[PDB]
Each structure stands twice: as structure tokens, then as C-alpha cells.
Design a protein around this motif. Structure first.
Motif, PDB file in Angstrom:
ATOM      1  N   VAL A  17       0.837  -1.186   0.000  1.00 42.69           N
ATOM      2  CA  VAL A  17       0.000   0.000   0.000  1.00 42.69           C
ATOM      3  C   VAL A  17       0.871   1.234   0.000  1.00 42.69           C
ATOM      4  N   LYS A  18       0.411   2.266  -0.693  1.00 39.15           N
ATOM      5  CA  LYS A  18       1.047   3.568  -0.628  1.00 39.15           C
ATOM      6  C   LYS A  18      -0.004   4.643  -0.802  1.00 39.15           C
ATOM      7  N   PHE A  19       0.045   5.642   0.067  1.00 40.95           N
ATOM      8  CA  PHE A  19      -0.846   6.784   0.003  1.00 40.95           C
ATOM      9  C   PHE A  19      -0.114   7.980  -0.571  1.00 40.95           C
ATOM     10  N   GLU A  20      -0.813   8.728  -1.413  1.00 44.62           N
ATOM     11  CA  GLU A  20      -0.230   9.853  -2.116  1.00 44.62           C
ATOM     12  C   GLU A  20      -1.289  10.942  -2.245  1.00 44.62           C
ATOM     13  N   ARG A  21      -1.006  11.928  -3.090  1.00 39.06           N
ATOM     14  CA  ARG A  21      -1.867  13.073  -3.308  1.00 39.06           C
ATOM     15  C   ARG A  21      -2.162  13.242  -4.789  1.00 39.06           C
ATOM     16  N   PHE A  22      -3.426  13.521  -5.104  1.00 36.39           N
ATOM     17  CA  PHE A  22      -3.817  13.962  -6.442  1.00 36.39           C
ATOM     18  C   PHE A  22      -3.442  15.425  -6.608  1.00 36.39           C
ATOM     19  N   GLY A  23      -2.163  15.656  -6.855  1.00 40.27           N
ATOM     20  CA  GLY A  23      -1.697  17.015  -6.994  1.00 40.27           C
ATOM     21  C   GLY A  23      -1.949  17.789  -5.727  1.00 40.27           C
ATOM     22  N   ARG A  24      -2.939  18.662  -5.773  1.00 38.18           N
ATOM     23  CA  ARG A  24      -3.264  19.521  -4.656  1.00 38.18           C
ATOM     24  C   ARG A  24      -4.480  18.994  -3.912  1.00 38.18           C
ATOM     25  N   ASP A  25      -4.458  19.213  -2.598  1.00 40.14           N
ATOM     26  CA  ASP A  25      -5.575  19.064  -1.650  1.00 40.14           C
ATOM     27  C   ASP A  25      -6.512  17.907  -1.981  1.00 40.14           C
ATOM     28  N   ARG A  26      -5.923  16.750  -2.256  1.00 41.21           N
ATOM     29  CA  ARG A  26      -6.710  15.590  -2.639  1.00 41.21           C
ATOM     30  C   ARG A  26      -5.834  14.352  -2.613  1.00 41.21           C
ATOM     31  N   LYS A  27      -6.299  13.299  -1.955  1.00 41.65           N
ATOM     32  CA  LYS A  27      -5.470  12.156  -1.621  1.00 41.65           C
ATOM     33  C   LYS A  27      -5.837  10.937  -2.444  1.00 41.65           C
ATOM     34  N   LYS A  28      -5.019   9.910  -2.271  1.00 44.02           N
ATOM     35  CA  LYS A  28      -5.029   8.750  -3.131  1.00 44.02           C
ATOM     36  C   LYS A  28      -4.412   7.599  -2.375  1.00 44.02           C
ATOM     37  N   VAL A  29      -4.800   6.393  -2.760  1.00 43.62           N
ATOM     38  CA  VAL A  29      -4.116   5.188  -2.338  1.00 43.62           C
ATOM     39  C   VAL A  29      -3.744   4.418  -3.582  1.00 43.62           C
ATOM     40  N   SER A  30      -2.891   3.434  -3.394  1.00 41.89           N
ATOM     41  CA  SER A  30      -2.536   2.581  -4.500  1.00 41.89           C
ATOM     42  C   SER A  30      -1.895   1.338  -3.940  1.00 41.89           C
ATOM     43  N   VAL A  31      -2.034   0.254  -4.685  1.00 36.65           N
ATOM     44  CA  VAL A  31      -1.350  -0.989  -4.391  1.00 36.65           C
ATOM     45  C   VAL A  31      -0.383  -1.260  -5.515  1.00 36.65           C
ATOM     46  N   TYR A  32       0.850  -1.546  -5.144  1.00 42.53           N
ATOM     47  CA  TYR A  32       1.901  -1.852  -6.067  1.00 42.53           C
ATOM     48  C   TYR A  32       2.428  -3.237  -5.727  1.00 42.53           C
ATOM     49  N   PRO A  33       2.480  -4.172  -6.669  1.00 45.24           N
ATOM     50  CA  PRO A  33       2.970  -5.498  -6.313  1.00 45.24           C
ATOM     51  C   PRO A  33       4.478  -5.550  -6.343  1.00 45.24           C
ATOM     52  N   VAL A  34       5.021  -6.733  -6.128  1.00 46.19           N
ATOM     53  CA  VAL A  34       6.446  -6.939  -6.201  1.00 46.19           C
ATOM     54  C   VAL A  34       6.898  -6.999  -7.653  1.00 46.19           C
TER      55      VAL A  34
END
Lengths: 81, 83
Positions: A64-81
Motif C-alpha cells: 500500500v502507498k498513500f499519495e496526493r492527487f496534486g493539490r488538496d486531494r489524496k489517493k491510495v494505491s497498491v503496487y505489487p512486487v
RNA sequence: GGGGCCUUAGCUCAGGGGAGAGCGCCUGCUUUGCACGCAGGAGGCAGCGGUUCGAUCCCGCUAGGCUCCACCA
RNA sequence: UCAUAGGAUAUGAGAAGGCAGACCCGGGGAACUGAAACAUCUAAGUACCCGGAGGAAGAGAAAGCAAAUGCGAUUCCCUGA
RNA sequence: AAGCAGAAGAUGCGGAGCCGCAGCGAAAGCGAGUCUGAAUAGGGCGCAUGAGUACGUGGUCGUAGACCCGAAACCAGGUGAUCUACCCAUGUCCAGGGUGAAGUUCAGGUAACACUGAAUGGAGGCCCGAACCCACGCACGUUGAAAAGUGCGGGGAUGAGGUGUGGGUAGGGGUGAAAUGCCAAUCGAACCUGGAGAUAGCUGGUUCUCUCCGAAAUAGCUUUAGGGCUAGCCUCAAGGUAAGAGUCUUGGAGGUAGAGCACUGAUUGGACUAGGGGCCCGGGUUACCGAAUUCAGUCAAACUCCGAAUGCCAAUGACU
RNA sequence: UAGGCCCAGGCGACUGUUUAGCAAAAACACAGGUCUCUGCGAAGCCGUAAGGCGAAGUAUAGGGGCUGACGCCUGCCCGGUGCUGGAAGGUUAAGAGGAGCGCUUAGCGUAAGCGAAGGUGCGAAUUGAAGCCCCAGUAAACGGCGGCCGUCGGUCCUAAGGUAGCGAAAUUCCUUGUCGGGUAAGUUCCGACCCGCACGAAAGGCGCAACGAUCUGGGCACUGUCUCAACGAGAGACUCGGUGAAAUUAUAGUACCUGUGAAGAUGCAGGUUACCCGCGACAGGACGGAAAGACCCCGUGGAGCUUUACUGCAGCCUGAUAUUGAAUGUUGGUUUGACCUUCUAACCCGCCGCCCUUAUCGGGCGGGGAGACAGUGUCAGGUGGGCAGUUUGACUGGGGCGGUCGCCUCCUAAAAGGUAACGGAGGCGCCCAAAGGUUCCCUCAGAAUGGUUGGAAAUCAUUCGCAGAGUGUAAAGGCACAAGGGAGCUUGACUGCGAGACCUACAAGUCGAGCAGGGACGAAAGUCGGGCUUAGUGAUCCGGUGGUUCCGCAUGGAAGGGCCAUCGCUCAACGGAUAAAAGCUACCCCGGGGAUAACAGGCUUAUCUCCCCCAAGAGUCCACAUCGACGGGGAGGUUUGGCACCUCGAUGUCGGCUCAUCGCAUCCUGGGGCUGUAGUCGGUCCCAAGGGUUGGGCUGUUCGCCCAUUAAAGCGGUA
RNA sequence: UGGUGGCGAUAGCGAAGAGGUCACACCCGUUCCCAUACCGAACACGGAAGUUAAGCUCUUCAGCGCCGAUGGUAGUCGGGGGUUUCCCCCUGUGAGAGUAGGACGCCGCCAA
């Protein structure tokens, strides 16, 4: 002695246990949920999906990794090996 | 409803008080039976009445309480007069 | 003090889509006629706030009144 | 009126009543309680009362068990459970 | 096992029966597979990762009085009217004194009466008051002389009278001039026995020692709130085994403190001013009020452009 | 030794009776009055019934209800409930009925399936009493007898609106109502008034002589009741001799000041004081003894009682049927049953005569009377607190009453999540067949300009315009690349499932890629397993409906059951005790509690009392002689209170008497300052607690008012 | 230039200018596809007479908006203290606001 009453403000709903359920850098299985919410405090990203309850789940296994949609807006994502 | 109320709304008698007074005198009747201000009424009722010697016979068609003026007389019909 | 009901024209009443039915007192008019009338006194949702395009009509807060209760040591 | 009721007499090791506070056969038949209250239900056909007994009683020779190249009165015990 | 033999025994016989070895399915049924299903799909339960059984000890549970004592109470069957309530039958007691009715007679009186005055008369749930009976007022006694009295007074005392003897009414009942009072020192339902070791989420009590470990007083549901169930917290054992924990580092979500006014609301002052006046000739002035706009300013648990410390979740390795 | 008396009033007419053992009464009874029932096997009552009381009576009697002598009276309402009567009509049982329907099966049948008779189960029409609905009457039956507006009237409603008489009452809270009497003084008493909180006519109204161990007030006399005690006698007490208990009791060599402490210490701390042992006396303490608190609460405890709580029972009424048959008619469809009359032999007779038999039992005969009725048995309906068994919730800053009980959203909530309170604000028990799915399209609210009707505000073009709008609904979160707004086509608001996750005690609840089948939209990718997300709902058992290559007790079927889908519950007290349930207890009881209330103590001190600050202002002028606004700050722990800490295996609670004691914020006395202090008297403030600080009326009273005095007639603490 | 993507507007708003033969646009007409709740505005269909005005690119700026330090302060874990409805001390951490300043763009692929 006196007599009084009638507060009529004496209830509340059952607490629904929102928030994140998995953490950044944490390994995850397919179908695991990540962030219960209402509406979108957070959006999905890669290999992540939203449900009818605006809840976020992993379509695959990965990390899991949490990030931002540019400005003032968040995101998650799953990245495999 | 009650007789006195009926008479007032139908404007046969101008005062419910006077209706009560005459019914207590028993000058009037219903269906051949002596009656009272508290006597129950309904459509189809046949009502005998007196005004001194003037005796009257009428028929009850309807009943209400709001009863504006000209719509009062729709409530019933005259049938006959004697003396 | 608490609960319930009520608070619409001078009086009594009905009526979320624009308050209108009747009655009475005083005065005036009025006239041939067996009390058969008319005009004016006047006809205005107790108040405050909110929701609705809107409120008497839904909700809430407060006042006035009526009823009920305000017990045990 | 027969006649009957009823009465009189003689015979009967008749039967009566008791029990051992137990066993059994039946007629009647509770409530507490439990059900976390409670009425259906249970307790319980118990307790208790009553009447009959016998050394045992009761049941008992199939208008049955059943469903196989069938068993052959009842009773009781172990199982079935 | 029952059962037979066997000294009340051990033992032998007795394999009918029971548990397990194969499960799945509601079941037909199939079978290391089975059920669902349209399905060789997937999924559940199972096998492959196998050990039970008989007996004994110990712990715990269930059913039985089931750790011990303890109710008020309920039911059945009986005993009691020698107390007391009422009634029935038969007996008996009420010193003395007083009042003076009705009736009768006489006299007056009256037409007659009515009426009036005396005498006689002797009534009365009548009077006073002893025995007798009852108990209002006080005092005393209150581990008493006495489990309801004594003393001083008190009420009734020929009437709904008191009292004796012999009897009757018996409890889901009786009796009651009625208080819920009496029914053998008891009574809003007598007493004895039995059911019965009633039941008791209630209180009290629960007997020798040492050692190891060591809590909770919280959640949820409860005709539930001082009870109970499960979870949480403790302990013991067998396994897995080294996952756990602390710190450091790194990354995350989270919008609290704080701060701020960009939203919503509340708010101060000023400037200008729509507009509305008051003043003069459609205008022309007024600082008379004054919308909005603007400048600056204060405030907020249910307001945020912002936003920490801490805490929380994980990963890597390091150290412990 | 044998009355104290009088005036007046209330209640009850009286004599009587009653809670043995707290209450003697205004309570009960009473004679009298009234209502009702009952025609004699009365009625009522006891009893399962026989048999009985009633009554060896007979409506001038007996039973029941209410009222209570006597006198004058006993008004209006019958709408409701009761009773009484009627009763055309509707409804309603059991029983009779018996159209039809199923199941089965011989047979027909290629099969499917149809299928007679019989058996069996279910059974419609029709009939079917009382009762109920309905209509009259009845109040010495239950019971009821009003309001508004106006200065007697008008009006609303009633079934009717309280007549007479009485009235601060045994009823009147306000209230010691007002006035008068009585008294020096009278919350009492009497008489009047009446705006009767909430009199009232047999729950009787008003009056009333006599009566009352009644209640109340006043007066004469009398008194040690008291002022205010004194003396004496006797019995105990005390000493001596003899005898000789009991309650209670953890052990005890058992002091007081303050403090602490489970908040009131003998026993603890610190300090003070105290030679050892007894006798007589007091009773402040040992929260003393006694009695597992009788108040309060709790118990899914009990008992008694009520009722329009629930369920039942007895009893009563009614009907069908059997006993219970012979006729004459009548009407119905098929002879038949039903109905009205009649008869007798059944049955019955608490009618007569005779015999059994000297018998008021019964039982046989004869008569007589009634009569297929009644009575009894079985079944059914109604009524039925007469009776029985039971229920009648919890939370609760004690309980009760109030309010709430489940779900959703926010804050409180302390930056994960979660987190309580009778804490603060609000919503749900739905809605849409398009408000869903898909494809494609575009973007809001308001403002300024211009412009008929158009108006401040429609619609209009117009530039400004992240968003001030909208998002079915409450709020929060979120959304303008749309999740918002339009159009087209459609029904994925699908079936079977589901890796794996969340939340979680459990039950449950939530998300979910992806597979298969079959589809919708779209060219295609691809989206679709309802809606922008979060509420919009409930167990199990029980039944019902549909479908089913399941089972179907010898066999074939069937009944019935199972599986799947689904319906039925504000079971809302929303994890629902039953299909089915309200109250009083002061006649009460048990188990427990200081886990929980009333007194007192404790903490607090909002409130209370007292003190103080600023000082405008009053004070002719002048703030501060004396007062002191709007405002502010403290002390005390005497008030009302809040909290529940000791005490429920008992801490006795107001007032008064006796006994005092302490504080001082001093009432007097003493000493002073200031003065709006001439004097005398005073006001206020300061120091001072040594001593003193009244007697009466009313009221239980505290308090308070009043009379008269005093130097003064103090405020408080000590359970 | 044009197309097409990535990075928080340090990219934007706003003002001023320059260019278009190619290219991109504007633009010319509906006969057909299709369309406009009205219609060739838009969407589609075809065309290229003329226009750089607009759009689009390239320059400039710091007016608006945006980014954003250091230091200091509040707050605060932890420890300690005190006249405690609060305050103070210490190690450590450490914002917001306000500044300094930055910036009117960085990076890619294709086509001529």
C-alpha cells in the motif's frame, strides 16, 4: 422538592468504525479493504477499487502507498512486487 | 342532531333558547311523539310543530352546523299546515 | 413548577394553495304592513423564530387562560 | 280376591372389625415448585383420602408382533435409547 | 450387560448390544468424496496431515434435598365453640329509696263534652344508688402481685338485662348491633400432621499447612440493572515455536490544542453611499436617518485557508 | 358515705352495642320512613343432592337495599349504566342439513389421462333460542346538576345545569377572611356577612325539647395546677442478719481539649490532667440494652381486597336431544318432519283416604291435580369478581408522577478507532417503474445593464461569475473530469456464487475483485448484481401461498412433512418472557439494604445572614452625619437546598419543662470617636461576653400579633 | 509550429506588445451522413475567397492570486514546582500568522 424533565436530546447513532484499516508499506491480499469512509475523503488509484459504500479495496496483492492527487486531494494505491 | 340546534341552523327559530322553551312547553312533536330539545333527529324525520294555533308539519332532508342563511332552508321542506 | 387542551372579526365557528360563515350590543336610517330590516361602530390566525414558492394549517421557543398532578416519610 | 309387601320362627365356623407406616388393583385427586414471571405444560396421576384384596396382586394364551423362505401366552431383567 | 455356575466374592461362560474405523446431504442417495448448483467451475463440510476403546483416580458439568441453616406463604387430610361471637332448651340473680303515667272514682266544669283539681292506681328499654356487670379519667406497675392488673373516682343497674348448666354452628368455613372484630393468651383467613430437606437471583456461615502464578470491579444483550451469558482480564497443561515487546530510523492516515477569518454564524468602530427624509426653486442643498460596498478590528464545541506535540498503524534493518 | 353547679354551641334523637389485650366515639344498632322482590314446593339462604331455616308463617307476611326519633321538606335531569317491559328488523351457537369438493379404485384406456359404485375426509345453501343492537318507562335506582361576553341581558354547550334551606362549617387553601360580642389582651369559641378553592336535599337537607364518662368555649365556687415551694406519716430505698436472680457481656490496667479518621473516638496523634480501693446519688456518653427497621427502596417474594385487567369455574337464563306417546287439524318438499290444540298411560305432587303402622319418613293401593310440560342426564350459547388462579416492565442523582426505551447524522470525542451521562442539536419506521442501468450531451445560485403586461421578484439576451446553487429526504462527509442537469434506448432494482477483507461476545451487519449463465446500453473498450454514501426495520416457533428427478410407518397412492421462494407482528418495553393480563393496602407479611430516601452529622455554600469595595445620587448647599442605585469581592455554616460519605442486625423525630453551657456579629449596663451632637433623648461606628436579659392572652405550635412592664425584654451553636 | 501526455496554479488571473506562406484557428454554404426541445451557433457534411483582429504561440511585469524559508512566539510529549476556575521552571519538539524571498512554467514522445 420540585419536578422537571424533558431533555429530548438523548440519543445518537451507532459508531461505525471508519478510517484506514491498512497502513502504508503494509502487505495486502486481494480483496482487502483499506479505508472505510463516506464519500471520498480519499480516492482509489492503481489496482484499487471503490464500492457502493465508498469503501476502498485492493484488487490484487501488493503493498500500500498513500499519495496526493496534486493539490488538496489524496489517493491510495497498491503496487505489487 | 339535537332538535334545538336543528331549528336554529334551519332558522325556523331564531334562538336556541326559544327552541328549548317551546320544546319544554311541549307545543311540538316528532312522528306523532311528543319530544324535547335534546331529541335526536335525522333525515326523513316528520316533524309536527305549533305556533299558538298554527300547527305545522315538515320533513327533514339534511342537517349541518355551518348553515349559511339561504342554504338553511335547503335542510328541510314544509309539508302541511293546520290550525 | 410538570403534563395535556386552547388562545382566528365585538361573540361563536370552520378552513399547508391566500381567513370567510353565522350571531349579537350601541348609534343612525327607515316605514301603510302581522316582531319579517339596512349601513356604520369593525370585521382580523397571542407573540418570536425556522422549513417551504407558501404556512392559521408542519416544526420549535416563549407568554395568557382552562382542566389534571404537585405524593411517602 | 287370589296374591304380594310386611311380619314370626329355625338353621349357618357367613361378614362385621383389626393390621405391617411395606408391597397392588381400582375410584377420587392437590399445591408448593420448575418454566428464571405465568395461565397451556411440569411437579403428577406423586402426596393424600376412599374401597377391595393376596401372599403375592395385576396381566395372560393372540380379532397380536410384524413384514422373513416368520414369531408363536403373560410377567420381569439387559439392551434398543 | 442382564443372566448361569461360583463363599454376598474373585473368576469362567455369555458377543445380544455399545464406541470407533468415512464422511457429505434435509432426504432419496452417493462415497474419499459429497452438497449446493445447469456446471468437468467455484465454495462449504470432509479425506489425504489416521487412534480409538474398556476400566480406574482426579477436576468440572447434568439430573436427583446436591455446600449448610433460614422464610413469609400454598395444597391435602384431620383436631378444636371447656376461651370467645351467635343461637337453642331449662334454671337462677338484681339491697333499699324515689318519681308518678294509663285507667277508675269524686268535685268543679260542659247541653254533652272538652277541660280543670284531688284520691286511688301503679306503668316505665324511668331516676338515685349497693350486690352484679362493664371499663373513661388519672396515677402506679411496665425483667410486674399480674403474659392486660391494682388504687382512687366512673357508667348501667326490671330490661335490647346479667349469669349458670346442658347443647348447636368449624376454616375455600362459622359467628358478627360490623371492629376485619372473635373462633382455646393467635385470625386480612385458626391449630396439628404430611407434601417437604417447599422455593429463596436474598443475608449469614463454610474447619490443616506451605509453595508457584495471580485478576476484575469493563463492553455487549438481558421484565435487566446488587443476578446471569459470552467476550475481556487469571491460571494449568500440550503444541507452534521466536512470531511478541521497547527504542532508533523511514513512510503513512487522522484535523485536536493552537492559530486564523478563506466559508457559515455572531460582532465593534470608521469612510463612502443606494435609498428615505427635513430645507429651497423636475431638480439644488443638508453630515437627519441610512441599504449595500469598503478600511481596520474581536469571537466560536457543533466555523476552517492552516496546523503541531503526543498517540495510532505498518516496513526495513540495528541494539536490547 | 352519699350531686359541684350554670351559660352557649357542634354531632348523634334517646336506653343500648363495639376494636377481649391502645381507640367508647360523631362509629354500629334502634323505633320510624321509603324502594324493591316474593302467589307459597314461595322468594331468599345452606347443602352435590336428599333434607331443611323461611314457617308448623301466607303480601297488614317474609327477604334484601338505603335512610335514621320527632317537626317542615325532600327540587331539575332517564342522555349514559342499570333494572322493568317491548321487540317489527339485523346479528349470533350447538344441533339438524347435506348442493358440492377432495382422496381412493373396478373399468376405460397406446400413453397422458379419464374414471361408475362403495368407503373416507371436508362440507355450501337453508333452519336455528336466549342474549346483543334498537324503542319506551323508572332517580328515597347507579348517578349527575355547566360556561363564556356585556353594563339584568346576549350567547355556547348540556340529558339537566343546584330549588328550598344552610353556609369560612367535623366541608373554606387563600386565612388569625371582615365586622361585632366575650377578654387588658382571644390563630380558639359565639353571632352575623358570603365571590360556597370543594354545602345541599333519604351517602338525606334545615331545625329541634330530653339524653351523652361525647367534642368545644365561657362563668361561680374550690383548690399546692402554679407563683415557689415547706413540713410531717407510711412503703421501698440506706445499714445489719438469712436467702438470693436476671437482661447484657470480644478481651480490657476503660481520663479530657483540639485534630484526624468510614467525615460524631476511651482505645489513634499532640498536649493537658490524674495516688490506690470502695459506698451513696445523677443519668451526658459508651451512636447504651431490648426487638435481623414496622417508614423508604429492592425482590421477575407473599397474602388480603377491588374492578368495565386476563383466563377460567360455580350459579342463573335459553335452546337441541333422550326419557317421551295418542290423536284432530295446519302448512313445506319429499311418506315426511315442523307448528297449534286435545287426551292419557309415562313422569311429577312438601294434595286427600286406607293398609304396611302405636310413625307429619317412604311405599303399596285407590282417588284427585298437573302432564310429554317440568325435572334430571349429555351438548351448546349468553350472563357471571359470587368464586379461584395470576399479571400489572425497566432506566431513574431515593421512589412515585413526568420523560425515554429501536435505528441514522453531528458535537461532547481529548488529530487512528472506540468512549458515558435524564449531556447538547436534529431526523427514520420512506420514496422513484423513473428520481434506476447504459450511451451521449452541459454546468449552477445570485448581482449589474437593457427592455410591454412584468411588478422588488417571472421569462428574456447581456458580462461578472469554483460553486454562494443542486445533490428525493435530517445532518456530516463528498461531488462541477461530475455523483449535479438534459435526451435516446432499456430493466443488472438479474440467477448461481465468491477468493479475500472490515466490524464484531454471539446473533448478526458491511465491502468485494473475479468465474459461469443469460442479457441491457454502447461501434469498441467497457459499465451495470439499484439508487451520491450513511437510517428507512425484527428473531425463532406457528400458520398460509406457489414450485419441487426428497420422504411418505406392509405395498401403491394419499394425508402430512421436508427443501427452495414468499406472505403474515409498531412483538415501539424494537435481541421480542405468554396467543392471552389493570389497580389498592393506613389491616399487612417475609427476605435484604445504609448498594437507596425522611431527622441529625459531614462536603459544598447556589440560597440565607453578616461584612466590605467604587460611588453616581439623596442629603437645601456637601458623596461618605445618615442612606446608597447600576456593579463588584469576601466571611460564617443558624435557613431553603444540592451530593449520598457513617448509621436501616434500629442514631427516636416538632414544641414545651428542668438543667445549663459556649460564641459575639452586644439588647441593657461600662468606656469612647463622629454627628445633619444646643440641652434631655438620639443615630452610627469602635473596644468590651463580667453579670443580667419579664409575666400574660391566642395558637400544639416554633415564629408571630396583642396587653401591661422593664435598664433591657439580644442573635445564634451545643444530634 | 501543431498534436498528445506527465508534475501541487512556482503552471494561474490581469495589463501591455509581436506572428500566421506552411500549420492551427477564425471563416463560406447545407446537396447529401447527422443535427439542432429553435436553428447548420454547436454537432456533422463539403469548401478555402480573406483574417490575424479573436483563439493559439513568443515576449515582457510581481497589481491580484500561488509557493515559501531562517529566527522568534504560542501550543506541547516528558520531568519538576507553585499563592492551582490557573500559572511557573528544564531537556526536547515546534506551528499558524507575519516576513525574507521565489515565480507570469518544468519535463517528455510524434509529425514538417
Amino acid at each position: 422538592k420540585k419536578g422537571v424533565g424533558s431533555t429530548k436530546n438523548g440519543r445518537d447513532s451507532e459508531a461505525k468504525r471508519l478510517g484506514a484499516k491498512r497502513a502504508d508499506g503494509q502487505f495486502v491480499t486481494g480483496g482487502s479493504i483499506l479505508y472505510r469512509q463516506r464519500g471520498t475523503k480519499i480516492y482509489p488509484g492503481e489496482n484499487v477499487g471503490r464500492g457502493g459504500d465508498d469503501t476502498l479495496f485492493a484488487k490484487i496483492d501488493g503493498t500500500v502507498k498513500f499519495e496526493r492527487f496534486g493539490r488538496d486531494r489524496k489517493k491510495v494505491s497498491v503496487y505489487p512486487v | 342532531m339535537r332538535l334545538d340546534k336543528f331549528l336554529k341552523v334551519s332558522r325556523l327559530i331564531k334562538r336556541r333558547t326559544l327552541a328549548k322553551e317551546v320544546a319544554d312547553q311541549g307545543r311540538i312533536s316528532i312522528n306523532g311523539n311528543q319530544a324535547k330539545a335534546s331529541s335526536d333527529v335525522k333525515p326523513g324525520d316528520e316533524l309536527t310543530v305549533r305556533f299558538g294555533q298554527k300547527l305545522v308539519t315538515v320533513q327533514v332532508n339534511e342537517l349541518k352546523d355551518t348553515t349559511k342563511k339561504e342554504e338553511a332552508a335547503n335542510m328541510y321542506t314544509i309539508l302541511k299546515e293546520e290550525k
